[PDB]
């Protein structure tokens, strides 16, 4: 029943990992919801929100798997946030 509950969460997470709530001057656009935090990404609750936020101020202008005691996904997020800024910061200089 640990192979099963890994088959569900592997499929019940593809929609989430293909898109933090948005709104409609820029600190009220996207804001963290505190309840719905996985409590194993709580360490990086600020780099996720900061990673996509930089992608939108440029867009409107013009794989992850869960493992225990292994942080292959915690490292995978830092490898994209370290690029999310290098495209926007360079976009303003």
């Amino acid at each position: 029943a640990q192979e099963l509950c890994l088959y569900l969460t592997k499929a019940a997470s593809a929609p989430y990992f293909e898109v933090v709530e948005e709104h409609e001057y820029w600190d009220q656009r996207y804001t963290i919801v505190q309840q719905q935090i996985p409590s194993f990404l709580q360490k990086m609750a600020d780099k996720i929100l900061s990673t996509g936020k930089y992608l939108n101020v440029v867009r409107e202008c013009g794989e992850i798997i869960y493992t225990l005691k292994e942080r292959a996904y915690v490292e995978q997020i830092e490898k994209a946030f370290n690029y999310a800024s290098k495209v926007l910061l360079d976009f303003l200089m």
């Binding site: 942080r71 292959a72 915690v74 490292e75």
Partner: protein, 84 residues
């Protein structure tokens, strides 16, 4: 993360592991648990050889990440020049 959060349970040690071997696992586990969180980094007779193989590699790597990414030695010398 070294002084506390790890306790050698004297009661649940199997008889087929000597009391000294039980302090080399509590030290290899602690060496890897501490290497991830604080250091911010991610990676019979054959049984006795496995513990020592996991010891002479993990600890030797803990110093490398603690001398190149933090220069633990370069502070001991610098803490003598000024503070002493």
């Amino acid at each position: 993360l070294w002084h506390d959060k790890y306790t050698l349970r004297k009661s649940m040690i199997p008889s087929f592991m000597t009391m000294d071997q039980s302090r080399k696992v509590l030290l290899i586990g602690k060496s890897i648990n501490f290497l991830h969180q604080v250091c911010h980094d991610q990676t019979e007779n054959a049984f006795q050889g496995k513990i020592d193989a996991a010891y002479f590699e993990t600890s030797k790597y803990l110093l490398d990440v603690l001398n190149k990414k933090y220069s633990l030695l370069d502070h001991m010398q610098a803490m003598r020049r000024y503070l002493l």
